[PDB]
Design a binder for this molecule. Structure first.
Ligand SMILES: CCCCCCCCCCCCCCCCCC(=O)OC[C@H](COP(=O)([O-])OCC[N+](C)(C)C)OC(=O)CCCCCCCCCCCCCCCCC
Ligand SMILES: CCCCCCCCCCCCCCCCCC(=O)OC[C@H](COP(=O)([O-])OCC[N+](C)(C)C)OC(=O)CCCCCCCCCCCCCCCCC
Ligand SMILES: CCCCCCCCCCCCCCCCCC(=O)OC[C@H](COP(=O)(O)OCCN)OC(=O)CCCCCCCCCCCCCCCCC
Ligand SMILES: NC(=O)C1=CN([C@@H]2O[C@H](COP(=O)(O)OP(=O)(O)OC[C@H]3O[C@@H](n4cnc5c(N)ncnc54)[C@H](OP(=O)(O)O)[C@@H]3O)[C@@H](O)[C@H]2O)C=CC1
Ligand code: SF4
Ligand code: SF4
Ligand code: SF4
Ligand SMILES: [Zn+2]
Lengths: 158, 210, 96, 320, 176, 388, 115
């Protein structure tokens, strides 16, 4: 057969992307209420595992961090610690108003006004709390975001 | 109990019983009790001099006609106009007699308050909360230290003069590879509303003119 | 009523546009500036005037409890129509 | 000025500084620090990036909401440059590779690209242009890296005469490829490839001082049209420097890797540069003229090398 | 009135003692626990096939915000600022002025969707049903800036979702 | 002090209660000292409430014990109503008991199943959240929100029950006792579960009262105390149910008490469905409760009261009250002080989990490290209310 | 009146004693802290900061205000010794990200209206 380098890189990129989105093992900070809706996303009706998303993942095997609740100033150092220990590729999902931008404690002295002040965020899931279905939509949006990555294709043209 | 659908009925037998017990406590501990009042919705409060905490709390716990075995709560209120700005409130519960009672005292920034842990072990964390949020020091407390605020947090947030958003905010700095505190700057300032109406609502609470 | 500024940016129904030298229009480069295209001012002009036969007419915007609060409008003046404060509908008194 | 670009606030995160900067090469070692400092004071940073969006995620926390904007660009496509500098006041250029690749050689990263970024910046109305060069840049140097730096520095000074050209020495820091080079390449799998290390004198500068120097060149109105030289407090002997690095990393030092695809780690030209001697050009202004005090190596070398250290230290000897 | 959850006295006849001995040695209750799990394996799973199937909602559901219009096309909002005053999270920012035709209309209407708690107090307080919480709950974004809605966005949401919003109001306005 | 193990649940697991930093001294397998550090979900809620009207402050109470949303609302509403000197109408009192018991079921499923999940028994967690998911639909149909309903308000409830809700609640309640029975077929007589809970974290009756415990933590030790029976507050004097009482004060009795409370909640829910009376849902007094949207668009007085209620808010007479309810976790109480304006002067929240967690060190003495997981679970700690 | 209940000290001599003791505990600690927390400062910089914190409160003469200052300083020490803090809390004393803020009239005049 005959094939260019550009074609080979495009197909290998699709393979690794398909594997990375098909097997997303999430770490979940269950900081507050939004953790309860994260638990409903694992329960029978939605069953995130059927997408390949394991119920429980350790911090140092995790692929995505889900920040489900209010990030207080006392807790912020610990969350950045966990984020650094995560091996790459690593993605953060910000779930709910509190994590997205402080929410209903935005004007508090003890609350970080959004977790994007601490860690980079890939997807923002609105709600207080987002419904289990709304979080599931967010995770499926992360899978499509990963599908569009072009790591190998960029590397070839460097 | 009246045919007024929207008005809370009055229980007058409870009001009478709580007033009788207010005198009883005042008669027995006259050295310490400064005031006794029962509200319209039937809640007895005993105001005491800050030095009568342990004698007053002990008497209510152990007396055969008090038996307020349970400390339901312990908190402080900040009223900056008062000279003793902090008011310490004890809510107690009696299961033998199915009754509640409130004990109140006061202090300032620089007056310690005797710890009630000797009387109610429940007060250990309540007083740590009072110290942390209000900066009221309790003497003879087994382990007094912050319980809610972040380590190294300067100030006492629940004081009326502490600003709502505080003075410092945290972010992550790439250059120093850690979470750094910095002076607070809000993208949108909290908008203060003046909601009080200029017309009096409750004549029964009118205060005499200066 | 979506007209564009000389730069090329569409003006909003509030009349806002980034002037020629404002750097804040970079936020739209590679993206788009969202502008609702149905201008409420131009749509409420199109509505016909409602000729009536009494001095006072009440408007609630339609739908009963799905409209705005009910307002009574005076139509004595002949030089102008009477307009609803809420919904902007116009009324006139018939041949009178 | 313009009512939008008038500084407001107290210089913090949510404040306004009036700096609207396009930083090319923002995703490198030097870029991450510049974007960080520009974003502490509330600047509007446009980040043209060639890489994946994933590789830029570290820059996002560095600004308030809306302050960091990202764009695609290609050094060969000029119209992608123009879209990046059209609304900017200062255009900082940090583009470079320590190594050649198939697509970009040293004469394309350092001459053709910087000249294109400088020309479009002129034609787009940009006012300030920061261009980075090398202290040891020389037309007659063997290291091709530095000879390209010499020509490219010559074309910027013609395309954009009011441009501030900054010439640093080897820069050291947490993510540098200078001290991290002496700790790793020399140690693991190898014994130092030092080529007559007693003959080389080095004057390295801390990253933050370079970052501070670049910022003040934006805020300082006399910097326009001037070439600068950023050098550390001390001159070191390349032999001693490597020795000192090893002591910090607790790796034993005993006096005495092919380039490949991926990312050449150790290369033919890199050695030629680590051995070039830090030129002294007294007439050029340095960090002293921008309000920055050069920081000692000793203070900010335990910071860099604490990671290499496995699981009472004496400094190096300076050359007057 | 109370009951004793665990105040039994175990019988000390040989027949009962042998029953507990058989249970201890033959793992009877443990087998029974295995039976219950076996029964669930043959029960039908409660999972639904998202996104092709969706969980049931009601007309009262509180989702994304939108600004509505009258049938004629004029905006319902009269800039009374009752929603801004009630908003528990201070998520709403309003400015107003007289429009070119003298009408009382906003020039700025913003909701910081990252401040909002999706409580629906603003739609309860609006006198003209101008601000509503729609039925959309699938609008997660990739950047924070995409969740700060200005007037155009909320007007566009009203134009986008009016068909459904109006029907939901029709279904619940009598309860309100 | 053989070794100090600073155990941070920072890298949280599927519990969702929050995050707890636990500092312990392990003299071998045994625990000699336990020291919970609890600032991680402190959000300044009590201070923020001072800048909000009474209506604006209500949603804060949904987000305290965020598995007891409508029970926290009722406590706030009962406190405010007491200061206002008004009374909610009889239909709303039944709706507030009805959803108070649907909330108790919601809380105990989380309490028992996540307690068992931490001790390795994962399956009942999935069995029962299919039921909580059906209960979340009742919340959404009456309020529009699955969790933070904001539905119980001073004066009554926001809206009336939609037509067809009570039938669906009855259908859920009819099949629910079997769901509990399946749960006991996996835990009640299971020797492994009993070995992990029997004679663990024993609390004496005398130490329970002095440490401030309430709820199951008292009744496990044999104290006959339930606020719904001794200090009833809505219509709880008109419904028959029994209080489960423990005999040994250990985790296993506390586990049994909660499972029996779920059965008594279904008993109560049955009576509420049959006795639901007709009428209005909020106090018919428009200086407190907003008027109907039809009246506000027709009547001048209604529009004025609507306008003021959603801006200034209703003013509450000066005074201070301590109101407590039998929340699922324990006694939930608010000490609310009114200065006479429309914004509370001070709102102190009494969380049952605050005292229970402070009593952890007492209970953990002389137990292995793996028992501490069982002790915290049996306390039913959620850090929304521990910190506030 | 001037008759006030005491915290610990009954006059400044006792208070200055506890102040002196608390400085001993901090002076000994900095060498340990700079290691356990792996700080990038020298032990000299750390001990200067402890000197700076103690100096700023020099004017105080009320015995009660000094007791509380000591009580708070010990709580700070207890957190650092027991390693309840983290590397971030310990380094907050040094304000290493806040840019230089001027203090001369002309400098404040150029930048903003703040007095
Ligand atoms: C190339 C071999 C190198 C060795 C690799 C490691 C060992 C060998 C393993 C081979 C992997 C075999 C599994 C391939 C999976 C295919 C994806 C798939 O299942 O389709 C469903 C998916 C479904 O799409 P979806 O993921 O978006 O589904 C969304 C969910 N639904 C549909 C329910 C809404 O189809 C795809 O999207 C294609 C994904 C890209 C597949 C790229 C891999 C194909 C092989 C290319 C090899 C190139 C070599 C050079 C020539
Ligand atoms: C042991 C067996 C286990 C089972 C099989 C395991 C899976 C095997 C199938 C997967 C193989 C995938 C290999 C690629 C690895 C992932 C690459 C990636 O993520 O991108 C990061 C990098 C992207 O490069 P980069 O340099 O841009 O990334 C770093 C970016 N900076 C510099 C900013 C930090 O990808 C690679 O490095 C690819 C390495 C080479 C891959 C092979 C290419 C050969 C084909 C092209 C040549 C054709 C010539 C004709
Ligand atoms: C898998 C299928 C499980 C069947 C359903 C569960 C069941 O039927 O077991 C119940 C039965 C009675 O057990 P129990 O309720 O404790 O009362 C017994 C009084 N001694 O329990 C039993 O009688 C089960 C006894 C099984 C015999 C012991 C196992 C031997 C294993 C080697 C074969
Ligand atoms: N650090 C030092 O020791 C010294 C550095 N300098 C100068 O400092 C500048 C940056 O330093 P450093 O940050 O260490 O360099 P880096 O290599 O660390 O980063 C360089 C940047 O240039 C970008 N880049 C490289 N090649 C191309 C290309 N062909 N097209 C587009 N973008 C490209 C890279 O983006 P991507 O990663 O996306 O490819 C990267 O962000 C360079 O110009 C260098 O010459 C001068 C003297 C000393
Ligand atoms: S966003 Fe809402 S539900 Fe989530 S933690 Fe915050 S208050 Fe609770
Ligand atoms: S739903 Fe509630 S928090 Fe959100 S904008 Fe409306 S009133 Fe404000
Ligand atoms: S949306 Fe409604 S409540 Fe808000 S300003 Fe407009 S008309 Fe008033
Ligand atoms: Zn009208």
């Amino acid at each position: 057969p005959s094939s260019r380098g550009e074609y080979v890189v495009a197909k290998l990129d699709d393979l690794i992307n398909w594997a990375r989105r098909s097997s997303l093992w999430p770490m979940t900070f269950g900081l507050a209420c939004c953790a309860v809706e994260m638990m409903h996303m694992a329960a029978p009706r939605y069953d995130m595992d059927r997408f390949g998303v394991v119920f429980r993942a350790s911090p140092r095997q995790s692929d995505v961090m889900i920040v489900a609740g209010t990030l207080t100033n006392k807790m912020a150092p610990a969350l950045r610690k966990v984020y650094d220990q995560m091996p790459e590729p690593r993605y953060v999902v910000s779930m709910g108003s509190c994590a997205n931008g402080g929410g209903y404690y935005h004007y508090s002295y003890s609350v970080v006004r959004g977790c994007d002040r601490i860690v980079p965020v890939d997807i923002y899931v609105p709600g207080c709390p987002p419904t289990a279905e709304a979080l599931l939509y967010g995770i499926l949006q992360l899978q499509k975001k990963i599908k569009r990555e072009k790591r190998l294709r960029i590397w070839y043209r460097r | 109990a009246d045919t007024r659908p929207t008005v809370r009925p009055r229980n007058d037998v409870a009001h009478k019983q709580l007033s009788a017990f207010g005198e009883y406590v005042a008669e027995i501990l006259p050295k310490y009790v400064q005031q006794v009042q029962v509200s319209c919705f039937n809640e007895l409060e005993i105001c005491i001099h800050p030095d009568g905490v342990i004698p007053v709390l002990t008497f209510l716990r152990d007396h055969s006609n008090a038996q307020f075995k349970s400390l339901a709560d312990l908190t402080a209120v900040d009223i900056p106009t008062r000279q003793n700005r902090f008011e310490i409130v004890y809510n107690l519960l009696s299961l033998r007699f199915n009754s509640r009672i409130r004990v109140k005292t006061y202090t300032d920034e620089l007056t310690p308050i005797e710890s009630s842990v000797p009387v109610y072990k429940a007060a250990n964390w309540y007083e740590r909360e009072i110290w942390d949020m209000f900066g009221v020091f309790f003497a003879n407390h087994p382990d007094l230290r912050r319980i809610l605020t972040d380590y190294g947090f300067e100030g006492h947030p629940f004081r009326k003069d502490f600003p709502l958003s505080g003075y410092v905010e945290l972010r992550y700095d790439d250059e120093v590879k850690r979470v750094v505190a910095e002076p607070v700057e809000l993208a949108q300032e909290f908008r203060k509303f003046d909601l009080n109406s200029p017309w009096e609502a409750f004549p029964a609470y009118r205060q005499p003119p200066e | 009523g979506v007209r564009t500024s000389p730069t090329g940016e569409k003006v909003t129904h509030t009349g806002q546009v980034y002037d020629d030298g404002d750097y804040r229009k970079v936020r739209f480069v590679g993206r788009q500036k969202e502008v609702n295209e149905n201008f409420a001012i131009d749509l409420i002009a199109e509505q016909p005037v409602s000729q009536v036969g009494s001095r006072v007419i009440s408007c609630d915007g339609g739908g009963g409890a799905l409209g705005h609060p009910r307002v009574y409008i005076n139509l004595d003046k002949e030089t102008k129509t009477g307009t609803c404060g809420y919904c902007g509908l116009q009324f006139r008194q018939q041949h009178h | 000025l313009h009512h939008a670009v008038i500084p407001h606030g107290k210089g913090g995160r949510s404040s306004v500084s009036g700096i609207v900067a396009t930083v090319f090469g923002a995703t490198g070692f030097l870029g991450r620090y510049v974007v960080n400092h520009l974003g502490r004071m509330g600047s509007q940073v446009i980040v043209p990036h060639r890489c994946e969006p994933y590789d830029t995620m570290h820059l996002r926390p560095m600004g308030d909401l809306g302050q960091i904007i990202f764009m695609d660009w290609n050094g060969r496509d000029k119209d992608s440059i123009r879209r990046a500098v059209e609304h900017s006041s200062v255009v900082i250029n940090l583009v470079g590779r320590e190594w050649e690749t198939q697509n970009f050689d040293f004469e394309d990263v350092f001459v053709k690209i910087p000249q294109a970024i400088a020309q479009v910046s002129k034609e787009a109305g940009v006012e300030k242009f920061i261009h980075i060069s090398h202290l040891n840049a020389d037309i007659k140097s063997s290291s091709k890296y530095l000879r390209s730096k010499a020509v490219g520095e010559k074309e910027v000074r013609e395309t954009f005469p009011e441009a501030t050209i900054i010439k640093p020495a080897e820069i050291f820091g947490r993510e540098d490829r200078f001290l991290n080079y002496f700790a790793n390449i020399r140690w693991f799998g190898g014994v130092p490839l030092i080529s007559l290390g007693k003959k080389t004198v080095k004057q390295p500068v801390y990253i933050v001082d370079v970052t501070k120097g670049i910022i003040n060149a934006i805020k300082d109105p006399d910097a326009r049209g001037k070439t600068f030289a950023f050098v550390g407090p001390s001159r070191y002997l390349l032999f001693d420097l490597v020795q000192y690095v090893f002591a910090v990393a607790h790796r034993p030092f005993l006096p005495y890797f092919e380039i490949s695809p991926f990312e050449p780690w150790t290369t033919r030209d890199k050695v030629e540069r680590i051995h070039t001697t830090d030129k002294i050009l007294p007439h050029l202004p340095g960090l002293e003229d921008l309000g920055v005090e050069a920081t000692p190596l000793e203070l900010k070398a335990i910071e860099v090398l604490r990671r290499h250290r496995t699981y009472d230290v004496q400094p190096a000897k300076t050359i007057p | 009135t109370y009951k004793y959850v665990n105040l039994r006295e175990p019988s000390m006849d040989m027949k009962s003692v042998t029953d507990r001995a058989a249970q201890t040695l033959l793992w009877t209750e443990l087998i029974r626990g295995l039976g219950m799990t076996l029964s669930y394996l043959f029960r039908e799973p409660a999972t639904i096939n998202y996104p092709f199937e969706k969980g049931p909602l009601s007309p009262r559901f509180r989702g994304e915000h939108a600004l509505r219009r009258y049938p004629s096309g004029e905006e319902r909002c009269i800039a009374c600022k009752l929603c801004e005053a009630v908003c528990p999270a201070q998520a709403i920012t309003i400015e107003a002025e007289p429009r070119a035709d003298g009408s009382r209309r906003t020039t700025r209407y913003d909701i910081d969707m990252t401040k909002c708690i999706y409580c629906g107090f603003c739609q309860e307080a609006c006198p003209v049903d101008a601000i509503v919480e729609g039925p959309n709950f699938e609008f997660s974004t990739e950047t924070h800036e995409e969740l700060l809605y200005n007037k155009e966005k909320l007007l566009n949401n009203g134009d986008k979702w009016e068909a459904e919003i109006a029907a939901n109001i029709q279904a619940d306005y009598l309860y309100r | 002090l053989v070794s100090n193990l600073t155990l941070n649940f920072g890298p949280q697991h599927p519990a969702a209660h929050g995050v707890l930093r636990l500092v312990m001294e392990l003299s071998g397998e045994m625990v000699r000292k336990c020291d919970p550090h609890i600032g991680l979900l402190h959000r300044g809620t009590e201070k923020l409430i001072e800048y909000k009207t009474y209506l604006q402050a209500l949603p804060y109470f949904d987000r305290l014990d965020y598995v007891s949303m409508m029970c926290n609302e009722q406590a706030y509403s009962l406190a405010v109503e007491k200061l206002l000197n008004i009374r909610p109408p009889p239909r709303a009192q039944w709706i507030r008991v009805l959803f108070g018991e649907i909330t108790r079921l919601l809380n105990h499923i989380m309490a028992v199943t996540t307690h068992a999940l931490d001790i390795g028994a994962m399956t009942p967690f999935f069995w029962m959240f299919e039921e909580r998911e059906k209960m979340f639909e009742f919340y959404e149909r009456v309020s529009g929100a699955r969790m933070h309903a904001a539905y119980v308000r001073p004066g009554g409830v926001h809206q009336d029950l939609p037509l067809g809700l009570m039938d669906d609640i009855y259908e859920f309640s009819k099949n629910f006792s079997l769901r509990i029975d399946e749960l006991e077929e996996m835990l009640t007589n299971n020797r492994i579960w009993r070995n992990r809970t029997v004679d663990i974290g024993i609390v004496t009756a005398e130490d329970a009262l002095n440490y401030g415990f309430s709820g199951v933590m008292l009744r496990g030790s044999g104290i006959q105390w339930d606020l719904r029976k001794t200090q009833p507050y809505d219509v709880y004097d008109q419904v028959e149910f029994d209080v489960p009482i423990g005999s040994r004060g250990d985790c296993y009795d506390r586990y049994l008490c909660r499972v029996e409370e779920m059965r008594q909640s279904i008993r109560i829910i049955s009576q509420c469905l049959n006795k639901m009376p007709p009428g209005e849902i909020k106090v018919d007094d428009a200086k407190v409760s907003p008027p109907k949207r039809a009246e506000m668009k027709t009547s001048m007085e209604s529009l004025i009261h609507h306008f003021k209620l959603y801006t200034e808010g209703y003013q509450v007479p000066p005074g201070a009250t301590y109101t407590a309810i039998e929340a699922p976790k324990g006694e939930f109480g608010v000490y609310l002080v009114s200065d006479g304006s429309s914004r509370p002067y001070r709102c102190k929240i009494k969380a049952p989990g605050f005292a229970h967690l402070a009593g952890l060190d007492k209970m953990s003495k002389g137990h292995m490290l793996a028992d501490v997981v069982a002790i915290i679970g049996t306390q039913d700690i959620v850090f929304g209310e521990v910190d506030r | 009146s001037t008759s006030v209940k005491p915290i610990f000290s009954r006059d400044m001599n006792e208070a200055k004693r506890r102040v002196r003791e608390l400085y001993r505990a901090w002076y000994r600690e900095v060498p340990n802290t700079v290691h356990l927390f792996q700080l990038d400062i020298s032990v000299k910089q750390g001990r200067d900061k402890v000197r700076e914190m103690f100096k700023k409160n020099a004017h105080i003469t009320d015995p009660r205000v000094v007791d509380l200052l000591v009580i708070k300083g010990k709580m700070e020490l207890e957190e650092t010794i027991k390693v309840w803090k983290q590397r971030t809390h310990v380094m907050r004393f040094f304000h290493e990200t806040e840019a230089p803020r001027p203090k001369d009239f002309l400098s404040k005049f150029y930048v903003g209206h703040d007095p």
